[PDB]
Paper text:
Analysis of the CDCLs belonging to the phylum Bacteroidota revealed the presence of sets of two-component CDCLs, one long CDCL (CDCLL) with four domains and one short CDCL (CDCLS) lacking the fourth C-terminal domain, that act as a bicomponent complex via a mechanism only previously observed in the mammalian complement MAC. Unlike CDCs, the CDCLs require proteolytic activation with both components containing a proteolytically cleavable activation loop critical to the regulation of pore formation. Here, we present the crystal structure of a proteolytically activated CDCLL and cryo–electron microscopy (cryo-EM) structures of a prepore-like intermediate and the transmembrane pore.
(A) The cryo-EM map at 2.87-Å resolution of the membrane-inserted pore complex, from focused refinement with C30 symmetry, reveals a β barrel pore with an outer diameter of 260 Å, an inner diameter of 167 Å, and a height of 105 Å. We modeled 30 subunits of EaCDCLS into the map, allowing a complete visualization of the membrane pore complex. This revealed the complete unfurling of the α-HBs to form the membrane-inserted TMHs that make up the β barrel pore, which is primarily hydrophilic and neither strongly positively nor negatively charged in the interior. Each EaCDCLS contributes four β strands, at a tilt of ~20 Å to the membrane normal, to yield a β barrel pore composed of 120 β strands stabilized by an extensive network of hydrogen bonds. As in the prepore-like oligomer, the HTH forms an interior α barrel, creating the narrowest portion of the pore. Comparison of the EaCDCLS protomer from the pore with the structure from the prepore state reveals no substantial changes beyond the TMH unfurling and further straightening of the core D3 β sheet. In contrast, the [name] pore contains only 30 subunits with a substantially smaller pore inner diameter of ~167 Å. However, we were unable to unambiguously visualize the EaCDCLL molecule, even after trialing various workflows incorporating symmetry expansion of particles, signal subtraction, focused refinement, 2D/3D classification, and 3D variability analysis of smaller wedges of the complex to extract the asymmetrical features provided by EaCDCLL.
Numbering used by the authors:
A (entry chain C), B (entry chain D), C (entry chain B): 98 to 197, 211 to 290, 302 to 374
Write the structure that this text describes.
Amino acid sequence: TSDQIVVTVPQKTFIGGVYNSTTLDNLDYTPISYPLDPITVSYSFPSDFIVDTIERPSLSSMRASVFKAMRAANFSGEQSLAFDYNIKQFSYYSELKIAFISGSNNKIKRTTGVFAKFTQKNFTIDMDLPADGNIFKNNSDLALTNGKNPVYISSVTYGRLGIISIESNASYNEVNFALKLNIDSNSKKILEESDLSVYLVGGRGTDAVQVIKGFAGFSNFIVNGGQFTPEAPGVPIYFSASHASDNSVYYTT
Amino acid sequence: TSDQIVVTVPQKTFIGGVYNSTTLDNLDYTPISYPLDPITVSYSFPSDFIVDTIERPSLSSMRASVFKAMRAANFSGEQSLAFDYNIKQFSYYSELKIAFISGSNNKIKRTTGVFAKFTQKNFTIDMDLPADGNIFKNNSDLALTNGKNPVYISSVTYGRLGIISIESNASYNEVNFALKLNIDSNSKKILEESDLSVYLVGGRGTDAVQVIKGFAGFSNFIVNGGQFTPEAPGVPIYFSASHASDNSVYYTT
Amino acid sequence: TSDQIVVTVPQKTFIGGVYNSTTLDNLDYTPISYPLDPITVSYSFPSDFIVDTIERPSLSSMRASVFKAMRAANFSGEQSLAFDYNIKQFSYYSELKIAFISGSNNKIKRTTGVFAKFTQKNFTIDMDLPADGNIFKNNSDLALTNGKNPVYISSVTYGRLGIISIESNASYNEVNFALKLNIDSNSKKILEESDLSVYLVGGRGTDAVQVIKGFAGFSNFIVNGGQFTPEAPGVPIYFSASHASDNSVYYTT
Ligand SMILES: [Ca+2]
Ligand SMILES: [Ca+2]
Ligand SMILES: [Ca+2]
């Protein structure tokens, strides 16, 4: 059970949207088309337009409200909300130098791997609890959707994601043999393999495209985007939903 | 099952278009010619014209709306949406130096290969869920197309694609023989093969045509187009569709 | 039993909110939708707007009040409230140099680990005890929620959190053998592993993203954010709640 759900359908992941719990669990996202009361939304970052109101919860309305809030006066993206980092570096080595009519066998093995995951939560837009205690305007739709598990998203997190994975393998198989008749034999085998997989969600495009240069771009893509600017608001990465019956926190498995 | 479908028919891949699920699965794209309510579209990038409305969903209307939105004020292509990178480098080696009336056999084998795939998602245009709960204007066309599996595209992703593949093979087959009668024999064979296949979708043309110079053009074509400009909006690369019955997310196999 | 509860649901963690004790204990946070009298809130930091009043306790109202209070005149973030630091450094070492037809065995083992936890409490917003002795406006809701364990949050702590953990392992397994017949044998094995996990809550984004450079960023992220500025108000990290029956301090297990 988790409180925050990773955004998988950006189109349907907007604040104030009502869905079925089962559909949200299996990534179907079947909406519940019923009227809803106007919702009050608040932003984690300090701004003049920190408390907005949306009559009809929709993706376009949420995007427009975020745009206006982050372009308003007294806006500061200087402080973020969360920053998780994790790196795992590993490096094996192997060397055999068997020697002995003559004979030699030199084997060298190398295996290097760096795996890095990073997430940053620039800010979140949160939804206020209804004054009437029910999100629905008619207040009878709650009884109408009995068995449909009405659950509405109440928080959307804007931030950046980044995953990198660099692997490398090296093999050396020198073999020498002499029978000084002057029979001679040599066998050299060098095998080199490399891999580098990157997955970035959001952030500055110029710094994002520089991660192709090994573990150097994925060292400035992070340090050049710590403060989120209104030109780079971030991407919805996580969201939280709550039950529509008792307004309790919805937990998914 | 996947949520995002790679664009194969750019003519028929426009937001607000209704097709049959089977036809979209087998790339037939048979349209459903029925009236539709005006659709609200939102853009992922920050701009003044971030929330547009289209009365008649069409490719020309979508293109014009994208053009106006990206030429509007307070537009920033500084932040992208996604960036996937993957590279695989491999290099074999083989060397035989058999020696022994005389005789020598020197065999050299080399095989190098670099495969790289990159995708960038500059932005997406998303469609709002209908207020009435049905995309059709008459609301009876939904029952009219029973058995036709009505599915409408609700999201179009603009970005760039790039695939490169460089292969190289080298062979050396020196053979010497002497019988010092002064019989002598020599056999030299050098075989070199090369291959380089590039496939780019979108991006700056000047940087795109420079990828012909090995793995150097496909190192600046990426780093010189991280920020998408209104002169280079990007190409529709992925799109998402939803069912017209329950407005649920459509998954294709 | 503890007096301060770590914030797990930022959406529901606002001052003046009434919840059930069991739901707050199991992180369900089921609200009690009943009218409440206007609440008086005070801020720990010195400011002109140090005593505010909120008619309807909500997250948006709390955020707006904090924004106005910290943007008011005579505001000083120079003095903080609490600062907890804890570091644990450990480093093992092992070295074997067994020697002996010949033979040698050199084994080297290293294991280093630094674990650091830091918390800073910039300020808190506290709630005054009701004049009537009951938070509810009607004064009968207290008897209405008998068995529901009415508990309301009365204090929210804004500050920063930081956890780092760096681990490293090194292994060396040199083995030599000679039988001077000139049989020779050598076996070298070097294994290096590294790990670095960081978790930051709040603080300056620019300093937060620099913690990726070992235990150097998590040495300036702390010293460059001691004084909290109105551009960096901090993040709600801890909160305290009290019973609604006798206005006593609520303790959770
Ligand atoms: Ca209502
Ligand atoms: Ca309709
Ligand atoms: Ca009272």
